[PDB]
Design a binder for these strands. Structure first.
Lengths: 393, 86, 62, 205
RNA sequence: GCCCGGAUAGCUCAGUCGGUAGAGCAGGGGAUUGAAAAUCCCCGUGUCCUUGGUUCGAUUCCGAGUCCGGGCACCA
RNA sequence: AAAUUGAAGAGUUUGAUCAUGGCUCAGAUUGAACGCUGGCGGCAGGCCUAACACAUGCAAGUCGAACGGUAACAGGAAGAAGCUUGCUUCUUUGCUGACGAGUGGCGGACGGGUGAGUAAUGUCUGGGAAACUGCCUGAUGGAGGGGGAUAACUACUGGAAACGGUAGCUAAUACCGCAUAACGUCGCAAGACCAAAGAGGGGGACCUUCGGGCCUCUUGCCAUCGGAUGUGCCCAGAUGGGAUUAGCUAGUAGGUGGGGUAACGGCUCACCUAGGCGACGAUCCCUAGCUGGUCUGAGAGGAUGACCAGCCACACUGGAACUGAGACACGGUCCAGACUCCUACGGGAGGCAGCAGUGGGGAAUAUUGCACAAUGGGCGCAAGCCUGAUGCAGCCAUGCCGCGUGUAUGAAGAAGGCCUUCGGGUUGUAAAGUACUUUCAGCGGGGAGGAAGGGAGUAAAGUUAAUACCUUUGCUCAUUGACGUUACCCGCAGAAGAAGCACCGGCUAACUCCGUGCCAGCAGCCGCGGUAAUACGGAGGGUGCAAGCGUUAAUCGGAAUUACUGGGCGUAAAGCGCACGCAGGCGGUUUGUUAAGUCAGAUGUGAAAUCCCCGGGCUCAACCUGGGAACUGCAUCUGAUACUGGCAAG
């Protein structure tokens, strides 16, 4: 027995970007704090601004949009992710999963290296819909020097062809919005004003055949094995018959639960993160290389032909040509997979800043069709972006 | 099973337990008058004591106080003791 | 136990978790078992078409 | 369940006609009777005591067209039945619906008659039976459904049944598309082309 | 999802952690045999991690990844 | 409606042979798994591992026709107020429908689940003698009067919560005493001694506070004696292993007295005597719920108790006690133990081996299904309420059977593959083509039975108060399906959607090619494979099975391979090195007598289910089910006495 989330208005998954120390977790507390007062009607309360051990323990940020809340046009959930290079995997997948991102910078530091890495992702894998927040503004004594601190960001925007001044760059002091300063509680909710209108709006593929590429998995006590992630397409109701394809044998189940943010769900919707309980499934067998789907709509493949562009050093691509016989990491929605690549007759290399036709051979199968996007990476940078032109067997 | 939706038949049982104790020990300690008159050697005082007892000796098994066919055998055993005296 | 493994192609390693049935083969000393191909960490044998139920190789495909 | 593959395959392997696939090839071009199957078909046949037993069991199961599970079943039933088991099993084989439909010329082969039965064609005692393993009762009448009287192959089959002797436990009328199962099936009229003792001697091994 | 270790001849051991990688144990060829053992005479293996990089030079340095062992981590 | 169809051989020791003998093995079966494959339907089946631990839900209650009450809800009734105005608000009123909660009675100890313990005083089979009861039922009698208590409630009040605390009120089919008692109970008898309940329906008369009283009817109660389903006790036989498993006991054995018990006994206390038990198995340790019965095999014998069902034990662990007809109890109580959890830090909570669900273990296992429809069960005066009980769909080739995957036809056989002597041969009528039909599945339409009882109305009859009330039956028509868009039927294309798996050295049915060259592996054994392999891997072709296929394990057969059925021992493994001799076994021959053994006889019994004999039905089958037979034996007793046994004589 548990309480139900009720699907009124659209609902969308977003996330913070930038370097460490900039405010990436402070902001996600502070926004949710003023929204519950201002949109939600509440008075400033200590259990609003701090949260319980039990929520931290499961919404560990790096697997869960751990804060979910409401605004006048849509509901939002929001993710906090590492500002350091020690862990980037969940940022670069979260880019393909979000309808836009919250770019966090501390006026004290300016931009740092991970602020210059994460900006490229909206061109490379996700969407160029970024809204900006300048933290710790209250520390700077002079507005005209705050403006020069901000002129670093207008340059960085223009580096990756984001409009340097037609992007909305809110001023705030997130640690002061969090605690309950009268001026900075009053200079955070401006960000939700732009978030409600800069997207301009999310749009859901909820007419289509159901496709959930699984991001992550949980083991519910007394109920069994849940698989969750952004639903890319289609719709779900409780008791539908479902097919799992991918890295495993194709199997059939019953979705015997459907939840979102630990609340019951009348309907799983496209473009948003949804969790699904599954009949005859053990936490032992399932893997993130799986895709839950409408029965007989997509099948697993290891081999495919594709078009792929090799980035130029302008975009932080290669300057060395990309040889045949390479072993790149690919990125498809919620999942990464590595494959060995091949180039056309008499092509040993393709140059940076050029498109080629390629045949890949993955090290494990995933469910695939034509028109599916990827990027390739070799570590320190993404080096190309492409699309599956047809599958092979 | 492990649980039942009521617990109240246990409390009805304790209410009965305490109301049985409160007069089962009454009817059982009057017997000290028969045994003391047996110990006094005298058949007539033994009988007067048991005559005070017959009112409670049949009634305890007629009534619930020890129930069943326990009056017959007690009334018989107590005659069978005091008829050893003369 | 020592357990015979049938047909060429060996994917198994010194910690590969596997199943074994009876395989009587007094030709090899003490061996009373046979390692089940295409089960747990054991994959099927290469270049097979006459086995499908045997060697873990499944029905041949286009 | 039925035999779907090449039917003269069987007749050639068992060296007999089996009264199935009763058509003909033009000018007897590659008519391929009286020869054994395959690339090694030119070999002279070799026996064993187990080969004769297996081949006599194949023979009777290729005559009446029955599965091995079906024949193993009938042999248990035969051994339950009083008298001698051999004749008890053969009585089961002679009474079953598809076989009685072939006997009554409605099907020129066993497979025509089993296809007729599959297609809900026969009612017996006036009540429909669409399955091969119904035992036709003595003194009952089999009657083709109106929606089955249209099979051109059955109307032809009853002509292919002419100058072909029929078991003396039944009569049939082409003109009605109705046949009387006049009386009880009779072992004193029809047997298989094998020795009934050898085909059950191998079950003891 | 994160962190750690393992990819010199079949095996082992060495080798300026940039400058034709050396030796042993075992093995291959030839002779002998119908074959094998044994013997007698000739001779080879290096996935010197795959793949990208740094450089004047990679075996040995740096990222990427795969497999295998070990650690850390979660329960819509 | 009786009755059988049941008994096997094979490969393998050497140069060759006979005999001996192990090993491998064909067959059947399992709550079986593994790996491949898979379309449709019925009925059957799904922990057989950890008695290992379970999140969360849901699963014994119920009766206003025992009592006090009126929280909730509606209603009536009455009050009050307003153009909500002859309709409407607010209030009151247990007054009525009605019911939250309280008191009270009866039942929850049944079903369902688990198989841990237990070789058992439990169980099985058959009997014995000192017993008892829910509740039904036979019969006989009865119902006097009074008191006392207290929850709900009332007020006051603590704690985070669990949990409540203080003081006040009062009802009964509740509580308690007295009265009063049999054929009752005790007592040898005189005599003494023991019980209890009402409630409800309804009318002419009659009282009357118009409440109630009286009456009658119905239903319930109490006492006592009988019957009956149910249950207890006792006794004999039977009940796995270790004797390298030889002593065990006074906490016993026997008795006497008391106590205790429903009754019975070292049950239990005490005394007195010293006995009791064992190698025809005490004791000790190991294993293990049993049985009906299930499987296997000619059966004997073995395995074996599972799916169902009879019985037994158990319910996270350990101790105790109780309520009561009955329970150290699954659903309950106190206490302890362990773990886990809540908490305001003071304090508290809990045990899926119900049902669905989950983690874990392991070779391996359904959906937090659905439902009032029908069955049983508990309360129910009845309407009604309860139920994870019950029924029934889902999931899965887990079980068994049935059905289909096309069929009829069809060649100068044509391409292609395969083999080849290069002629042809073959795959194969197989394909194409020609002809027919669509079962099943599909799509659409139609559509039986599980439904009886039960509701209300109404008639006549009976009960009775002349009378209602009450009740038996009839009749009218009111009404009831989860499964479920059902079973089943009808239309309609159209071959359309339905073959894979193992096998081809021998045992073992199936041969040819190519590569491999003691290699890859190949078999269960014997074995194969070292460049002309039906034994390998692939190919084609062949064999066999089929929506299943193979393989592994497990059990049983084959085995007579521990030989009653059914063996050997000079020497095949094998006769005690010898004597003497107790235990135990065995004992000439004749007369009488006896009858334990044996044999004949009869009566009682071993339910169901299972088998058999003979049917019936669901189309057939699987499946379901009827009737009839079956049950080797046991108990007790009647007859016989040839013979073995006994006793006596010779």
């Amino acid at each position: 027995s548990k309480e139900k989330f009720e699907r009124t208005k659209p609902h969308v998954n977003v996330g913070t970007i930038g370097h460490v120390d900039h405010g990436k977790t402070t902001l996600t507390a502070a926004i949710t704090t003023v929204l519950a007062k201002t949109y939600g009607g509440a008075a400033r309360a200590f259990d609003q601004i701090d949260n319980a051990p039990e929520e931290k323990a499961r919404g560990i940020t790096i697997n869960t949009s751990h804060v979910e809340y409401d605004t006048p046009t849509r509901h939002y959930a929001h993710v906090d992710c590492p500002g350091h290079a020690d862990y980037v995997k969940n940022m670069i997948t979260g880019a393909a999963q979000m309808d836009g991102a919250i770019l966090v910078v501390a006026a004290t530091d300016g931009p740092m290296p991970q602020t210059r890495e994460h900006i490229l992702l909206g061109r490379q894998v996700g969407v160029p819909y970024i809204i900006v927040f300048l933290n710790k503004c209250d520390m700077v004594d002079d507005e005209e020097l705050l403006e020069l601190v901000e002129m670093e960001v207008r340059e960085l925007l223009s580096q990756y062809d984001f409009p340097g001044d037609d992007t909305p760059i809110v001023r705030g002091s997130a640690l002061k919005a969090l605690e309950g300063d009268a001026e900075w509680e009053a200079k955070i909710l401006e960000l939700a004003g732009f978030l409600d209108s800069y997207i301009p709006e999310p749009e859901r593929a909820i007419d289509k055949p159901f496709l959930l590429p699984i991001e992550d998995v949980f083991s519910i006590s007394g109920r069994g094995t849940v698989v969750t992630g952004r639903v890319e397409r289609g719709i779900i109701k409780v008791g539908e018959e479902v097919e799992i394809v991918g890295i495993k044998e194709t199997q059939k189940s019953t979705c015997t639960g459907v939840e979102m943010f630990r609340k019951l769900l009348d309907e799983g919707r496209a473009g948003e993160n949804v969790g699904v309980l599954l009949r005859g499934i053990k936490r032992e067998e399932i893997e993130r290389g799986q895709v839950l789907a409408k029965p007989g709509t997509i099948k697993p493949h290891t081999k495919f032909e594709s078009e792929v562009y090799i980035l130029s050093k302008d975009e932080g691509g290669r300057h060395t040509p990309f040889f045949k016989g390479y072993r790149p990491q690919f990125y498809f929605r919620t999942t990464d997979v590595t494959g060995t690549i091949e180039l056309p007759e008499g092509v040993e290399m393709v140059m940076p800043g050029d498109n080629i036709k390629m045949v890949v051979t993955l090290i494990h199968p995933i469910a695939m069709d034509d028109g599916l996007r990827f990027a390739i990476r070799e570590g320190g940078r993404t080096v190309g972006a492409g699309v599956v032109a047809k599958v092979l067997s | 099973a492990n649980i039942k939706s009521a617990k109240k038949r246990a409390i009805q049982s304790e209410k009965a337990r305490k109301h049985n104790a409160s007069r089962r020990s009454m009817m059982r300690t009057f017997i000290k008058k028969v045994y003391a008159a047996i110990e006094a050697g005298d058949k007539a005082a033994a009988q007067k004591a048991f005559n005070e007892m017959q009112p409670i000796v049949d009634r305890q098994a007629a009534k619930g106080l020890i129930h069943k066919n326990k009056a017959a055998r007690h009334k018989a055993n107590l005659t069978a003791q005091i008829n050893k005296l003369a | 136990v020592t357990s015979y493994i049938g047909g060429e192609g060996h994917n198994l390693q010194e910690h590969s978790v596997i199943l074994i049935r009876g395989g009587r083969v007094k030709d090899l000393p003490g061996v009373r078992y046979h390692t089940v191909r295409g089960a747990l960490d054991c994959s099927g044998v290469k270049d097979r078409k006459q086995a499908r139920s045997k060697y873990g190789v499944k029905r041949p495909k286009a | 369940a039925r035999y779907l593959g090449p039917k003269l395959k069987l007749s050639r392997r068992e060296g007999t006609d089996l009264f199935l696939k009763s058509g003909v090839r033009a000018i007897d071009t590659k008519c391929k009777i009286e020869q054994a199957p395959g690339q090694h078909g030119a070999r002279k046949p070799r026996l064993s005591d187990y080969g004769v037993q297996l081949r006599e069991k194949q023979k009777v199961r290729r005559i009446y067209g029955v599965l091995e599970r079906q024949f193993r079943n009938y042999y248990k039933e035969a051994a339950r039945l009083k008298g001698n088991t051999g004749e008890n099993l053969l009585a089961l084989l002679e009474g079953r619906l598809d076989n009685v439909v072939y006997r009554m010329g409605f099907g020129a082969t066993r497979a025509e008659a089993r296809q007729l039965v599959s297609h809900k064609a026969i009612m017996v005692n006036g009540r429909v039976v669409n399955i091969a393993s119904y035992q036709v009762s003595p003194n009952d009448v089999v009657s083709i459904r109106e929606k089955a009287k249209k099979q051109s192959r059955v109307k032809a089959a009853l002509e292919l049944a002419e100058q072909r002797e029929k078991p003396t436990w039944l009569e049939v009328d082409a003109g009605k598309m109705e046949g009387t199962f006049k009386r009880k099936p009779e072992r004193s009229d029809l047997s298989a082309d094998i020795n009934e003792h050898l085909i059950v001697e191998l079950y003891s091994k």
